[PDB]
């Protein structure tokens, strides 16, 4: 009467969205599996985020730039939404360079391209420069995990660099449904469906695999008892 | 930004084959409950044990009848049978019927059950019933393997017309309490400390039960492999 390995279905939409189904699972195992995976997905999935910004003729965060409509606070708030995917596994830091002038709405595309680095949200607005307004930025993206505020890392590559709050996690949302299902004559079985929305840096399936690996590694910790 | 995570020390604190405290610290923020809740669900729902599932007592029609010559009613006898801790030494055995025939002035214990091959009654001193001069008790109880808890009116198994179904208390675990406390490692401030508390009936030990729980959970983690 022991229930055996269930079918595992995968539905995807681009690098952004993913549904992952397991059925049939024993009663109550829908939650038992879904909830810890959701916690690990929301809390411990590594990723990328901007961690520092230098702007020429800008000494600190509470500044304006002539010709630029946005103040530096809004520029850093915009850069906080920049999704930066690294292709090389062993890469840790990238320094994006942006140089712009004249009347233009500087977007995320305008960053000079670097090898093995893709910008996943290129339409992201950065600034609204007018005639004669010049913007010269060097932003720094690091690999990391979780949420690390600027007050804790203080990352500055040059003297007048502005540390930035970093939301490293690439997971934007995690839900999971537990629906009723049957196998043969057994009733009250669980059908688990994890819905995962990411930013594109890592895909829902990669995030699910990393979370599963983290949970298995944590279960490893009960292996060596001690009186 | 840069993090270092010391592998957590696992600590056991047992008192016989009935109880144990299990401490796992330090854990990254949140993983205390992330580990405790699934393990608790598993320990309460899926650890294999045994249970009395049906009882036939001669000349007894229904469950709420009285018995001549015995002081307890049938309900009390069924409760005492619910508290019977039976252990199966052979992994292939799945069901046994236990015979018990006694009379005269005597207080039946769990010892008085006729021994069956590879069926160890862990608690032979468990009281069952008292009889008087002229009291007769001929009963057969049905002991099945299973997990969790199944009310009598959900299996309703009847070998004969007057076999009373008994709520199957399968689970060898009687209670699982766990509690997460904040802990620090140097100047890491919000680390977690997990403390499990497992009560069993002696058929399986708390440490055995926890290991079976983590094994079940890892095997379920393996179910995300083959789309």
């Amino acid at each position: 009467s022991k229930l055996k390995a269930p079918v595992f279905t995968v539905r995807t939409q681009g690098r952004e969205y993913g549904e992952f189904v397991l059925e049939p699972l024993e009663r109550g195992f829908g939650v038992t599996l879904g909830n810890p995976l959701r916690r690990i997905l929301l809390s411990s999935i590594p990723g990328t985020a901007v961690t520092s910004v230098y702007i020429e003729d800008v000494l600190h965060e509470f500044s304006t730039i002539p010709g630029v409509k946005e103040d530096v606070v809004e520029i850093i708030l915009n850069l906080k939404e920049l999704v930066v995917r690294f292709l090389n596994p062993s890469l840790q830091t990238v320094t994006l360079l942006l140089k712009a002038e004249g009347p233009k709405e500087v977007k995320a595309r305008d960053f000079l391209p670097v090898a093995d680095v893709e910008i996943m949200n290129p339409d992201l607005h950065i600034a609204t420069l007018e005639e004669g307004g010049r913007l010269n930025m060097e932003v720094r993206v690091d690999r990391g995990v979780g949420y690390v505020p600027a007050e804790k890392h203080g990352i500055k590559d040059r003297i007048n660099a502005i540390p930035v709050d970093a939301v490293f996690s690439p997971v934007r949302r995690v839900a999971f449904q537990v629906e009723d299902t049957r196998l043969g004559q057994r009733t009250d079985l669980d059908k688990l469906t994890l819905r995962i929305w990411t930013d594109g840096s890592v895909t829902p399936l990669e995030a699910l695999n990393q979370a599963v690996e983290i949970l298995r590694e944590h279960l490893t910790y009960f292996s060596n008892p001690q009186a | 930004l840069d993090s270092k995570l010391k592998a957590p020390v696992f600590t056991v604190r047992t008192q016989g084959r009935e109880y144990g405290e299990f401490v796992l610290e330090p854990l990254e923020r949140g993983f205390g409950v992330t580990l405790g809740n699934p393990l608790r669900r598993i320990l309460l729902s899926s650890i294999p044990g045994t249970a009395v599932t049906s009882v036939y007592i001669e000349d007894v029609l229904h469950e709420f009848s009285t018995i001549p010559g015995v002081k307890e009613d049938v309900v009390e006898i069924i409760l005492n049978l619910k508290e019977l801790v039976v252990r199966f030494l052979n992994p292939s055995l799945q069901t046994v019927t236990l015979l018990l025939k006694a009379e005269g002035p005597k207080e039946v214990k769990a010892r008085d059950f006729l021994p069956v091959a590879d069926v160890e009654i862990m608690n032979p001193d468990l009281h069952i019933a008292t009889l008087e001069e002229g009291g007769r008790l001929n009963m057969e109880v049905r002991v099945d393997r299973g997990v969790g808890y199944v009310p009598a009116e959900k299996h309703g198994i009847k070998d004969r017309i007057n076999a009373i179904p008994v709520d199957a208390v399968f689970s060898p675990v009687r209670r699982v309490a766990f509690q997460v406390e904040d802990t620090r490692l140097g100047q890491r401030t919000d680390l977690d400390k997990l403390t499990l508390r497992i009560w069993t009936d002696g058929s399986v030990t708390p440490l055995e039960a926890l290991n079976q729980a983590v094994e079940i959970l890892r095997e379920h983690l393996t179910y995300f492999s083959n789309p």
Partner: protein, 157 residues
């Protein structure tokens, strides 16, 4: 209070039955609620007190865990050797007190089991615990009541 209150339902509404199996079958048909007051053969009871009879607190709370019954259903439980008609929640509260003071007989003497716990009864509990066990044990009792009151108020809805 939320865990120590008992449900009172209106479906059965005081039907009379001869044998308890009649009441069980009636409730199974959907004609009587689990906590509706009825009278089987002459004594006032409910279907819940017959359908579910637990040998000990641990079994009752295991059934509560598995969703068989809720903490506010009136059930039959065997605690301290007596056959009690009470909810699993009141058993759980008695156990909270007993574990806190590390004295099962005194803890059973202190509590009022058959009443929902509220400001006045909990105050009398704290005072009697003081008189009978000392301020150290009463302080541990207070911290236990705090822990479980907060826990159960969170998920109560």
């Amino acid at each position: 209070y939320y865990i120590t209150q008992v449900r009172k339902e209106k479906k059965g509404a005081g039907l009379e039955f001869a044998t308890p199996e009649e009441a069980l079958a009636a409730h199974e048909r959907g004609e009587v609620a689990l906590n509706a007051p009825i009278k089987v053969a002459g004594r006032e009871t409910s279907v819940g007190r017959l359908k579910y009879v637990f040998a000990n607190p641990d079994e009752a709370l295991l059934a509560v865990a598995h969703g068989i019954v809720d903490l506010q259903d009136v059930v039959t439980v065997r605690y301290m050797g007596k056959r009690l008609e009470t909810s699993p929640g009141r058993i759980l509260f008695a156990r909270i007190v007993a574990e806190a003071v590390e004295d099962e007989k005194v803890a059973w003497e202190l509590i009022q089991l058959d009443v929902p716990q509220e400001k006045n009864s909990l105050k009398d509990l704290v005072y009697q615990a003081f008189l009978r066990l000392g301020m150290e044990k009463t302080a541990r009792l207070l911290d236990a009541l705090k822990y479980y009151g907060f826990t159960f108020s969170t998920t109560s809805g």
